[PDB]
Structures are given as C-alpha cells and as structure tokens.
Design a protein around this ligand. Structure first.
Ligand SMILES: COC1=C(OC)C(=O)C(C/C=C(/C)CC/C=C(/C)CC/C=C(/C)CC/C=C(\C)CC/C=C(\C)CC/C=C(\C)CC/C=C(/C)CC/C=C(/C)CC/C=C(/C)CCC=C(C)C)=C(C)C1=O
Ligand SMILES: NC(=O)C1=CN([C@@H]2O[C@H](COP(=O)(O)OP(=O)(O)OC[C@H]3O[C@@H](n4cnc5c(N)ncnc54)[C@H](OP(=O)(O)O)[C@@H]3O)[C@@H](O)[C@H]2O)C=CC1
Ligand SMILES: [Zn+2]
Lengths: 96, 125, 460, 208, 115, 342, 86
C-alpha cells in the first residue's frame, strides 16, 4: 500500500518521507529511492479469521519447526478476536 | 639502594592522553544503583568509575548515532572507593565520589498480617 | 526523588526509580515516571527574535544576545526585573541574580509566593520541612493544613501512609475533605479553626498537648492567597503552644512547610524575593522570564513596548509573549543543583545533550553578561558552584539535610504583624486525580499525561 | 556426573603440589605463594626481585629443567596498587610438565629483563613494553614492536579507550597521510550484560 | 622514605643531565632530518618544535617520570635517525590539517556544548 | 534554520557543518582544495562534472560516507544546473579555462555560464553565491580573458545581487600554471621576457589562502554582497620573480628580451594545438601585464587569514623541477628575491 | 556605598562560631526589628570558618571573618557595616 507525498516521494511502510525543505532528497537525484511494495500490515489484514470450537487455541505459525515458538491463545472475550503475538493470525469462537 | 621520592604520584605525562581529555573531564566514582526491574543484588557489589557524558548527534547518511569523544564507553571497576580515588588522582582526573547506599534492615513479621487490633492486618491474601 | 534515566543512542528511553531510603526509597510518582514523553515535543531549539511584522523568527546566538545586551545596557535598577519558573536550577538562578545585581537591580522574583513579613527568608527553618521526610516515621500526631499531600507530594503522602499503617500514626486535616488513601480526622475547612487550636479552645489542641512527637505541616499552596501571612502566623502560634505546653523534646522541629515546586527552596536560599508583588508595584521595562510559565504576569500588568526575554526549553505560556527567545536545557540535559523541600541539595547528571542550538542556562547568562560588558567571574561549572558556596554554603553539600533551628526568633518576629484571616475555605489547587497529571511545562506537553487525563475524565 | 562433566586427575594434582612445595622450600627468599588449580596447573607467586634467580633455577635445575619459555605476557588490574601482573609460562620437556611464575609491578618500577635466561623473552618483553608501558632493565634493544611509529600511549591498559584517540586519513592539500582526533559515524554501543543474580556460590566473597 | 627504587637517576640533578644530553642529540639531529626527509620546513622550525615538546613536560618533578620521558625521547630519536619514521610521522608533530580551536568562552559557547 | 541543517559534532570528518554546497568547476586546480576544505568539516558537497568520471576519483576520499555526491551537468543546459542546485544553500562557481576551445570561448565560460548559474541559483532559492573573477578584470583590457571576466562579474551581480565576488591574482601551487609555467620554460634553453620583464609587477597569492578565504566568506554573515581582492603579501618585478623561480629549481637562468609582436607570433604558433596549448597569445599578454592595486576593496586579512608569502611555499612546487643533484636542498638556502613594496 | 544585603555564614557546632551563634540567639531579632526591609540571610558553613558578607549597589560585595569573635565583637562589626564607615 504505497502512497505518494506532496513532493512525489514514495512513502515507506514505516512512514518515512523527506520533507520539502530537507536537503537529503538530493541523494535520490539521478538515482532511485528503494521502497518495498509489500506492506505486511495490509497483507496480514487480508487473512480470514479462523473459527474454532475451544476456549484455548494453539499457534506455531505453520510448518512446524519452521514457524515460530508455539503459543496458546485464549478466546473467552466474545467481542474480540484472539491474535497471535508472532504471526498476526486471528482466531475466534462461533457466534450468533 | 633507594632514592626516597617525596612527590605526589602523577603519570599523566606518560599515558599518551591528550590534554583536553585530562583537564576538562569529570569522573564519577560510585556503586551502581540496583536495577529496579529485578531483585538481584549481585550488580551492586563493586565500585565503578565512569566519565561525563558528551555530545551525540545523528549521522546524516543512515541516521546512526555519532560521537566525538573517545572516553564515552570507558568504565572501570574497583574493589573499594579508596582504590578508585587513587587511580583517578594519579591519572589527573577530577572526580566526584558518592557514598554507598545500603538498604536498611527491616523488621518482617508474617503474624502481623493477622493482627487483632492493629492496621497491619491484611484484607486479602 | 532519585531516579535512573535510561538512554539509548542519544535518546531518552525511560525513567526508573533509584533507591533512596530517606526520600522515596523504592518508588516514583506516575508523573515522574511517564512525563519524559513531553520533552520530545514543543521544544525550543533555536534563538528567536521579532521581525518587521511582529512574528518570531529564527536567528543566531550572536544576534539575539546582542539585542538583549543592548536592551540591558539601556536601562538600570528598578527598570530591570526577572521571574524564575518552577524548574530552574540553582546555577542559573545565581548567575541571573549576579547579572541583575550588576545592573543594580534587586527585582529577582519567583512565581511561588512565600510570606515576607517578620523573619521571611532570613531564616531557613522558616520555609523548610524541618521534621524531614524520614522523621514522619517517628511522629505520633500530624496536622495537615491547607494541603493535598497526595498530589502535591505523592511520595511524602506515601511516607505518611507508611507511618499510619505501621506506627498507628494519627492524622488530622484542616481544609477540604480530600481522599488521602488513609483514614484521617477532618476538623474542618474554615481557617478560624486554626485560631481555635491556637487559643486552646479545641479538643485537638488537647490532643496535640499530649503528643510527645507532634508534627504540623502547612502546604505552600495554602500560602498563595492574600491571607497567607496570617495563616503562617496562626500555624506558628500553634507550634509555639505545642513547644510551651509540652516543653522541649530535644530536637524534634514541630514546625514544617511542604513545598511543591522544585526550584523554590534554592531560590529562597539565594535571596530571591518570593512572589511577584515587587514586579506589580514597580512595573519594569525589561523583564526576564527564566522558565516562567505560570502566567502570573501578562502584558496587561506591564507597560507598553516592554522588552520581554524568555529563556527555557518548552514552548508554553511564556514564549509567545516574549520579544527574544533563548533556548535552554532541560533537567535531563545538564548537571544542575536542586534543593529539596527538606532543604537537601542534590544534583542531576547529563543523560543527553540539549537539542538543536540550545545551551546550558548558566552558560547562556554568562555569555550574555560578557556581551553586555558586565562579565561574570565564573567560566566553568565548578566556578559557578564555588559562587553558590559563596552565597549559600548549604548548596554544595549534596546529601546533608541537618540544619539549625531558629523557630523562636521566627515566631517572635511573626507576632508583630496582626493581619486578619479570610472567611474563605482552604481549597487545594488539585482536588482530584485529573488535576494531577498536568502541572508544569513538561507534563503539559506529554501525550501520556493527556491520555491519563482523558482516561480519568471518562472511563470508556 | 559422568558424561557432560570434565574428569579430574588426582595423580598429577599430587605431583604438582609436591613440586610446588619443593620449589617453595628451595627458594624461601622470593617465593610468596604456591597454588595448584583444580584442572592441574601449578603457579608460583614471587617477589619481583627474584625474577632472575627463580627462572634460572627452573631453567637449570636437574629436577626442574624448564628449558622452554612458552609465553610471557602482562595483565592489568587497576584496583591494585601494583597495577601490572607479569606471567611466565614455562615448559619442561624432560618431565613433560608446565609451570607458571607470577610477579607484579607498577608504572614506575622496572622489572629485570630475563633475556639472559631465555632468548625468547627478547620480543615478549618488547611487546609488554609496547602494550602496557612496563620498562625492562638491561634489555639489549627495547622499543615498540606492535604499534605505529610515534604512537602515544599503551593500548592494552584498561583505561585506554577501545578506538584510541587518533585516526588516519589521506589529505590532498598536504598530499600525505595525516592523523586527527577520532570521530565515529556510529559510536560503539556498550552492552550491560551481567546478571544481577550470583552464578557461582563457591567463589562468593565475604561481605566485608 | 616511601621506599621507592630508581630507574637510572638518583635525584633530579642526574635526571636534568640526561634531559640535557637528549636535547643536545635532538638539536644536532634536526638539520639531518630536514635534509633526509625532504621537509618543506626550516631548521629553525624543527628546533622550535623540539624545544616546544621539552617544555610541555617541564613541570614534572619526579625523577622516575623524567627518566621514563627521557627513555621515550631516545626511542623517538632512534626511530627518526634510522628513517623508520616516514615523512607523515615527522609532520604529525605540526598538526597542519587541524583547524584551530579558540579557547575563549564565547567561541566555545557558539560552536557547541563542550567545555 | 531547518533542523537537519543545524551544525553538530566537533568540526571533523563525521561532523555536520550545516553547509550544502554545489561547487561548479570542482575538478580543476582550485576545485580540489575547495572540496577538500568543505569535506574536512563535514559539509555535503555536490560536484557537477562534465569530464570522464575517472578524472573525479581523486575527490572521492575528501568526504565521509555520503558527503560527496557526483552529478553530470552541461554548461549550456539550464535544467542540469537546476538539478544540481535544487537542494544547496551555497553555490560556488570555479568554472574557467585559460584557452578557447572550438566549442567554448571566453565569452561562453566567463559570461554565459556564470550568468546561467547565478540566475538558476537565484530562482532555486540558493541564498549564498560565490563567484570567482580576476583581480585584473577590465572592460578595456587588451586581453580577451580579462574583458570577459569583467563582463561576467557585472552579469553575475545583476542576476544575483547578494553574491560575493572574489578576485584573486595569479594563484601559485602544486598544480598551478604560474610557477610550473615559468619552470617549464627551461626546455627552450632561454627565457624570453618582454622588456626583460623589468616593467611588470606581480603579487601572487597562495592556493590554500584562496580556499580558506572562500570558506570564511561562506561562514561570514557580513560578506553577502561584498567584493574581495585576494593577493599575496609581496609584490615582485617579473624578472626578479622568474630569477627566484629558477634559483629554487637550481636551473641555469638565461633571460633574453623578446619584442611584443614576436611573442604574439609565438603564442599564435602554440595556439594551434588541439590539446592543451603550451601557451597562447592571451596568456602571453596576461603574463606581461602588471597586477592592479585596489586598496578600496577588502582582502584576505578581512577574513581572518594572514597571507602566506611565496618564500615559504615555493619549494613544495619547484622541488619537482630539480635534478637529482639538488633534490635534497633545504628551503632556507636560495636567498629570497627582492620586492618592490611601497 | 548603598547596602543591599547581609549574609552571615555560621557553623552549627564549631567552637569558633559559638559567639556568632550566641548573637543570633540573643540579638538577631532586635536587629531585624531595626531594619525590617533589609535581607539578613543566615546560612551554615562547613568546617572552615565563620564569615560575614556585605553586598552593595551594582554587585560590589566584601566579606569579613568572624572567627572566634564574641557576641559584642559581631555586634560591633555589624553596626560598622550598617553605618557609613569601613
Ligand atoms: C601545466 O604544466 C605544464 C606542463 O605540464 C607538465 C608542460 O608540459 C609545459 C610545456 C609544454 C611542453 C610539453 C614542455 C616539454 C617540451 C620539451 C620536451 C622540449 C623538447 C622540444 C625540442 C625539439 C628538444 C630538442 C632540441 C632541438 C634543438 C633538437 C608547460 C609550459 C606547463 O606549464
Ligand atoms: N589559477 C589562477 O591563476 C587563478 C584562477 N582564476 C579563476 O579561478 C577559477 C578556477 O581556476 P582554476 O582552478 O585554475 O581553473 P582549472 O583549469 O583548473 O579548472 C576550471 C574548471 O572549470 C571547468 N570547466 C572549464 N570549462 C568548462 C566548460 N566549458 N564547461 C564545464 N566546465 C568547465 C573545468 O572542468 P573540466 O576538467 O571538465 O574541463 C574545470 O573543472 C577560474 O574561474 C579562473 O578563471 C582567478 C585568478 C587566477
Ligand atoms: Zn502464529
């Protein structure tokens, strides 16, 4: 989700962009500013929420030993989804 | 035989240190305070000598932190305050000494949690 | 409170408590812990002057210093004045005092008001917490007058609660019924009660008479009304009756004054005039604002075309009204002396350097003095502290709290002025928690304190 | 206790203790202490004045025959009145053994050169002079060995900064390499690593 | 007594004699250094620089420190005579590319925070 | 003052000086010294170059990482100048050529290019412009080179009113065309001098003094629209100066008088070279012309610089021109020449 | 010439300050009632010596040692400072 700035400079996913008065912009003349186009926040927001039939679920990021340390997530709050602290995947219990 | 010098120990002319980093520096001799996030006391046993903080500025190219003083990372360990004072004096550095802070002994009583008439009785466990 | 400042790569990261058994001993208040955020915004980084259109414009140190020096050489005496704010250090205070003394000016004032009749600032014990913070653990009765110790001095209130819990301490309050997190006896809120305890016509006078280790604490915030002198005289009369009926218990120092401003005690030690009344009576033509952001004096109280100079670290009440802005250093950016409400002198250490073109405050004053022709003798920090020792030698003893007691002389000098009390209840400035988070320039710029205010005013 | 723990040898411990007692008995004028570490290393702490005799004894004695000087270096401990610790490591090929000899000095006290006993000492002492500033008397040719020509200071001292005081570059105005005060684009970042909890109870010090 | 042992000199007189011998050697050597290293300075400049270095440690009152300083000076002279030093090493005494720094309070206040 | 441009550090290689300077003509004689002085204290330097990048390599070690940026430019293209001055707060113009090429003449390099640089810098918002002219610039000067200098300084003043103009006189140094030019005349055996060089007075100035003066003018708030004259401390008759140059180089001096028209003919003959000419008619005229005295203009001393005499710096230039026999001779041997001072 | 402030630095339990202490215990108050608009700052010294500081117009000030003085001596010197002499 790359947007442009008033000077035309591309904005990074961390939100960095030189101001108009900033002289450091001169380093991009006759060259380019390296920006990664795959914003992880939007990509993780695109993932669907899993529904499970237990109060506690377990997440390891997928791939077993190729994922992250395995953690357990509580799903007692009905008006909220449980989020993995490593992966960002979301889990919930069936409602309504 | 011996010559019996009657002067004060002074080795500044032999250490190679520039004059500016001798006369304009203030060293601090202290026992470091316990980190309040932990209960361990093993880091509050020795005396430390450290130098006064100088300027740091952002690097233009990568925004890193840049310094111009060479003593910004120098920390010395000593067994006693007198040893640190002697080292600082013989190296020509002017110093500030802070006395050691030791927690005072406390009177603990588990029974006081259930006092018949005092305010120390706990409402929960 | 003793603290540890955590910094990384030239940036202040967090504030942690540092153990001092006599002062805070493991804790800090929430403002002390979370107000570091404020220092990162609304900061003064460059000198500023007024352009052709009356707008503030960046300029070099030389230009601003030259303008201030010319304006200072123009005038003399009562036409020059200064106001010291709540976060000023002793070194800058003594430097500014010497600079204005070279002009033969004595209008060196603080925003916080202390009564000047009788002994005034001549005797230190007149304006100190003589029992000390540790001494609260030895008292059996403490009388609180016109104060809210919970928010004015949270760690002092914590010590009071410790004594209440472990020593069965008896606490009585005169003022509005605030919540102090411990049970106390509420005598009332009218100041007449003070006289009733001074005349012996109150049961609590009897209670104080049988108290072998009594304490009476009067808040500085209660001395801000017009009848502060009479209130201080009444409290002194109560302490007199305690000392006379109960005799002398050795060295107990019943009389006590609780301060809320970090710079007040050092300024009183150096001879600053408490209050801003001298400025009102003789409106100056050149005014120095040394971190003064209490809005005590605006441009309505001053004549037109008055030259106002602000020296500080934050853009707040004081900066937009100034003709020249001199960016100074914050307390995390200098080694500076601060004196306790106990009277204990302590020093800060440099954690990070001042941002932009900001400089050490005493260095700014010394450079200005050299530009203006009246060069101050001291050139380094050690020489400024030697000057401090010259003016008040207790400012260089960096953990000492013991001092002489002159209660008899101050009490005798306090009973020759018989001004009357006011029929207004004693109301502390901070009545609830929401008035706690934002009190000074740094905490007003903090986003965390704003979040705390929003959270306490509405739960959600 | 078996698989992960290093086994100990008691025969070598006994033999090294006996030889330490032997050396201490023969040379009471200079030997201040004798120790045997629990991984079977023998050290002898001596007065500085006995650097030449003791070493000579160890080199030429029929029962010692430590004829190889493996290493000679210094250790800097600022908290001591005598700052510098001089360490000799000797090897006996006849008896297949190793021994360590230790002494002390400060900044202004010379130590006698041991080049007459071991030729190998010649460069080692030079290194000690270059890195720590310890002067050796009667050295045939004592001068810097490791540092740049004209270098000021002794970099292996604890109070010497890691990056030093000067840095080099090429200047085109003078058309030569020049030295200037150190300026670092990224300051070296000091890490505070020690745990606040004690690790080894067997080494606990009395609370004074 | 303080029970200290000497390096070479017994008191300050012998130390001063060694200092004078070292100064004589350096003074004699300066013109040869100017010739061999092809320096653009004059012989007077080199001798003034030699004089300046000696004056810097003039204050020292301990014979052991003076002895060590003389040893270091002899080492430096040996480095110079044998052309172990290069032209850059000799010219490092003159700090030709270092911009001058003012010692006045105002100049330091203007540039930065350093005292 | 734009926080990112607030000076920081100690004034060394990794410090921030607060200067963003675009230096036109930075690949020449004065350019290398100017760039080195800017990079010593941690300035951001922008180098517009038209030559082969191999010929800019010697400027790369003069700055910390990221502090020297190289960009192509065309002297006849306004957009190149715009691109290379869009972000600078200081523009320095050191563009010049001693001879005329088939594609650029004196009017192109001393009038049109400086005028374009000044106009585009003024439009871009550059606040400081330094323009280098000649001390002998005159509208009625016989030399083509001097007349274009005067016209160009007038046009630069018109386009950028707050510009600082600096007029040096015969800069000498390791890569100069003044001491090297006279030393190289030994290859013809004798030195031809118009009127034996007895009616020409020179006041040469050291290169490092000029570079330091440019730096101090950049850092001087009072030097905005001022015109300076950078000259050396002594004035010499041309004969005496050339005699001293040959004495420092330990070469035999054989001066002989050549008539003006014959020397003009020799300059014509040498102008035909498609490479850098050994000499030109304009060059001959400049060499024989006396240096002007302009006491009403400020000088190097007004910028805190004590002018370096030629007697202390001639050996560092002329030692290269000696034979093996005289290579080790010290600087105080060659009996400094006489000066016509006051 | 115009007195602005008086500063008395006396030590808490040093013998040499005793007389000065006595003065403050006996005859400070009267002085305060004689000069009710004059700053008389009483502060404490470290182990060195007693001292009296007198500050005048335009930042001029001088100090007089009160070491081993009795109360009469300190009263004499104080009224000498307050009057137009010395
Ligand atoms: C920027 O520096 C400069 C140079 O660059 C180093 C030069 O070469 C230079 C002079 C240009 C020439 C290349 C000089 C060299 C020419 C000689 C080799 C002369 C040889 C010509 C003769 C025919 C020699 C033979 C004599 C006959 C009688 C047969 C000048 C003036 C100069 O200024
Ligand atoms: N040296 C002296 O005696 C004194 C010099 N003068 C003035 O000082 C300035 C610099 O002097 P100096 O260093 O000796 O001259 P140089 O010959 O050494 O270099 C001049 C610079 O201008 C550039 N340049 C020249 N022509 C053009 C062009 N047509 N287009 C683009 N760039 C060009 C050159 O780049 P490139 O390498 O690509 O050709 C070169 O970088 C000049 O303006 C000169 O007039 C002032 C008094 C005398
Ligand atoms: Zn996961």
């Amino acid at each position: 989700g790359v947007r442009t700035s008033p000077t035309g400079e591309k904005v990074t996913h961390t939100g960095q962009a030189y101001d108009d008065g900033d002289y450091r912009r001169v380093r991009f003349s006759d060259r380019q500013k390296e920006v990664n186009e795959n914003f992880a926040i939007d990509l993780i927001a695109e993932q669907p929420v899993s529904e499970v039939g237990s109060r506690v679920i377990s997440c390891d990021g997928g791939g077993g030993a190729l994922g992250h340390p395995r953690v357990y997530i509580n799903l007692d709050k009905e008006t909220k989804t449980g989020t993995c602290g490593y992966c960002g995947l979301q889990f919930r219990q069936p409602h309504h | 035989q011996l010559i019996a010098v009657d002067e004060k120990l002074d080795i500044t002319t032999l250490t190679g240190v520039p004059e500016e980093h001798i006369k304009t520096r203030k060293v601090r001799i202290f026992v470091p305070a316990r980190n309040n996030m932990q209960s361990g006391v093993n880091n509050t046993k020795k005396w430390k000598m450290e130098f006064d903080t100088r300027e740091r500025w952002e690097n233009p190219l990568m925004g890193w932190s840049s310094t111009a003083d060479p003593l910004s990372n120098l920390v010395l360990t000593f067994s006693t305050k007198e040893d640190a004072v002697a080292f600082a004096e013989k190296n020509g550095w002017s110093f500030d000494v802070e006395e050691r802070k030791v927690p005072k002994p406390k009177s603990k009583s588990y029974g006081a949690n259930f006092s018949w008439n005092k305010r120390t009785r706990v409402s929960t466990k | 409170s003793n603290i540890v400042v955590s910094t990384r790569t030239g940036e202040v990261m967090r504030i942690l408590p540092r153990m001092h058994e006599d002062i805070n001993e493991e804790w800090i208040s929430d403002k002390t812990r979370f107000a570091y955020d404020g220092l990162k915004r609304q900061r003064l980084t460059q000198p500023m002057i007024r352009n052709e259109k009356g707008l503030l414009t960046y300029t070099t140190w030389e230009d601003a210093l030259s303008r201030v020096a010319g304006m200072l050489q123009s005038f003399q005496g009562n036409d020059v004045a200064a106001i010291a704010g709540g976060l000023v250090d002793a070194e800058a205070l003594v430097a500014l005092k010497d600079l204005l003394n070279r002009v033969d000016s004595d209008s060196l004032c603080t925003e916080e008001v202390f009564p000047t009749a009788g002994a005034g600032t001549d005797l230190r014990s007149n304006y100190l917490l003589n029992t000390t913070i540790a001494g609260v653990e030895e008292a059996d009765v403490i009388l609180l007058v016109g104060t809210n110790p919970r928010f004015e001095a949270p760690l002092f209130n914590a010590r009071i609660r410790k004594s209440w819990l472990h020593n069965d301490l008896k606490v009585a309050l005169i003022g509005s019924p605030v919540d102090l997190t411990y049970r106390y006896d509420h005598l009332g809120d009218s100041p007449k009660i003070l006289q009733d305890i001074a005349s012996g016509n109150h049961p609590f006078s009897q209670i104080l008479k049988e108290a072998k280790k009594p304490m009476v604490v009067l808040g500085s915030s209660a001395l801000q009304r017009s009848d502060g002198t009479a209130i201080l005289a009444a409290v002194s009369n109560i302490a007199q009756n305690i000392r006379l009926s109960s005799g002398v218990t050795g060295d107990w120092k019943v009389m006590n004054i609780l301060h809320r401003i970090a710079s007040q005690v050092a300024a009183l030690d150096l001879g600053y005039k408490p209050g801003v009344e001298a400025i009102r009576k003789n409106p100056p033509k050149v005014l120095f604002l040394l971190g003064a952001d209490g809005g005590c004096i605006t441009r309505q109280d001053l004549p037109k075309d008055c030259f106002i100079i602000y020296q500080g670290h934050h853009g707040d009440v004081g900066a937009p009204m100034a003709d020249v802005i001199l960016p100074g250093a914050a307390y995390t950016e200098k080694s500076a002396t601060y004196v306790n409400t106990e009277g204990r002198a302590q020093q800060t250490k440099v954690a990070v350097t001042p941002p932009g073109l900001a400089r050490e405050d005493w260095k700014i004053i010394r450079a200005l003095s050299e530009i203006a022709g009246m060069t101050l003798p001291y050139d380094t920090l050690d020489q400024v502290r030697s000057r401090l020792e010259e003016v008040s030698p207790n400012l260089v003893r960096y953990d000492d709290v013991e001092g002489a007691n002159y209660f008899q002389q101050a009490n005798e000098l306090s009973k020759l002025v018989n001004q009357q009390l006011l029929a207004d209840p004693l109301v502390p400035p901070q009545l609830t928690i929401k008035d706690f988070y934002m009190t000074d320039s740094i905490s007003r710029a903090s986003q965390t304190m704003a979040k705390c205010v929003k959270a306490v005013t509405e739960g959600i | 206790t078996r698989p992960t723990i290093r086994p100990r040898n008691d025969v070598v411990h006994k033999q090294l203790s006996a030889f330490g007692q032997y050396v201490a008995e023969i040379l009471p004028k200079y030997v201040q202490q004798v120790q045997v570490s629990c991984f079977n290393e023998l050290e002898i702490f001596i007065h500085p004045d006995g650097v030449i005799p003791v070493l000579t004894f160890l080199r030429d004695h029929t029962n010692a025959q430590f004829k190889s000087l493996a290493d000679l270096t210094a250790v800097d401990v600022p908290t001591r009145q005598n700052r510098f610790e001089i360490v000799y490591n000797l090897l006996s090929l006849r008896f297949n053994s190793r021994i360590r000899v230790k002494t002390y000095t400060d900044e202004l006290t010379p130590i006698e050169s041991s080049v007459t006993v071991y030729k190998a000492a010649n460069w080692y002492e030079r290194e000690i002079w270059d890195m720590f500033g310890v002067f050796f008397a009667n050295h045939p040719d004592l001068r810097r060995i490791l540092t740049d020509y004209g270098f000021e200071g002794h970099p292996f001292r604890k109070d010497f900064p890691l990056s030093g005081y000067v840095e080099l570059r090429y200047d085109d105005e003078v058309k030569r390499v020049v030295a200037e005060p150190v300026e670092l684009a990224q300051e070296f970042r000091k890490f505070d690593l020690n745990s606040p909890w004690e690790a080894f109870p067997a080494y606990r010090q009395p609370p004074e | 007594g303080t029970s200290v042992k000497p390096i070479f000199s017994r008191d300050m007189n012998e130390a001063k004699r060694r200092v004078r011998e070292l100064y004589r050697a350096w003074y004699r050597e300066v013109p040869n250094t100017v010739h061999l290293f092809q320096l653009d300075i004059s012989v007077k400049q080199g001798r003034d620089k030699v004089r300046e270095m000696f004056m810097k440690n003039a204050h020292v009152t301990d014979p052991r420190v003076v002895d060590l300083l003389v040893i270091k000076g002899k080492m430096e002279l040996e480095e110079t005579i044998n052309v172990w030093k290069q032209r850059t090493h000799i010219m490092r005494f003159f700090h030709e590319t270092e911009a001058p720094r003012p010692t006045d309070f105002l100049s330091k206040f203007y540039v930065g925070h350093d005292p | 003052l734009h926080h990112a441009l607030i000076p920081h550090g100690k004034g060394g290689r990794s410090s921030v000086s607060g200067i963003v300077a675009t230096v036109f003509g930075a690949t020449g004689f004065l350019g290398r010294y100017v760039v080195n002085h800017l990079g010593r204290m941690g300035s951001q330097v922008i180098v517009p170059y038209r030559c082969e990048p191999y010929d800019t390599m010697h400027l790369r070690p003069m700055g910390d990482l990221g502090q020297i940026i190289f960009m192509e430019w065309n002297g006849k293209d306004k957009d190149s100048i715009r691109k290379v001055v869009e972000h600078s707060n200081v523009v320095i113009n050191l563009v010049g050529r001693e001879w005329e090429t088939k594609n650029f003449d004196f009017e192109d390099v001393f009038v049109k290019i400086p005028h374009a640089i000044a106009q585009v810098s003024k439009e871009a918002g550059v606040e400081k412009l330094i323009h280098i002219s000649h001390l002998n610039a005159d509208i009625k000067s016989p030399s083509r080179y001097l007349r274009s200098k005067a016209v160009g300084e007038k046009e630069v003043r018109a386009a950028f009113p707050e510009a600082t103009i600096i007029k040096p006189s015969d800069i000498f140094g390791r890569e100069d065309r003044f001491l090297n030019y006279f030393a190289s005349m030994r290859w013809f055996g004798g030195v031809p001098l118009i009127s034996l060089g007895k009616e020409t007075v020179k006041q040469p100035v050291y290169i490092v003094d000029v570079s330091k003066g440019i730096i101090n003018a950049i850092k001087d708030p009072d030097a905005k629209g001022k015109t300076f004259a950078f000259v050396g401390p002594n004035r010499y008759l041309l004969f005496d100066l050339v005699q001293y140059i040959f004495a420092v180089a330990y070469r035999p001096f054989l001066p002989y008088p050549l008539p003006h028209f014959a020397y003009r003919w020799v300059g014509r003959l040498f102008e035909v070279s498609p490479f850098e000419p050994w000499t030109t008619r304009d060059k001959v005229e400049r060499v024989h012309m006396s240096d002007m005295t302009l006491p009403h203009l400020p000088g190097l001393e007004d910028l805190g610089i004590q002018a370096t005499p030629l007697e202390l710096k001639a050996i560092e230039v002329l030692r290269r021109h000696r034979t093996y026999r005289w290579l080790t001779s010290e600087m105080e041997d060659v009996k400094p020449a006489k000066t016509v001072n006051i | 010439l115009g007195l602005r402030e008086i500063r008395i630095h006396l030590c808490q339990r040093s013998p040499g300050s005793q007389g000065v202490r006595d003065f403050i215990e006996k005859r400070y108050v009267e002085l305060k009632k004689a000069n009710p608009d004059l700053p008389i700052l009483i502060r404490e010294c470290s182990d060195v010596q007693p001292k009296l500081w007198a500050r005048y117009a335009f930042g001029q000030e001088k100090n007089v040692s009160l070491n081993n003085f009795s109360a009469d001596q300190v009263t004499r010197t104080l009224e000498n400072v307050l009057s137009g002499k010395a």
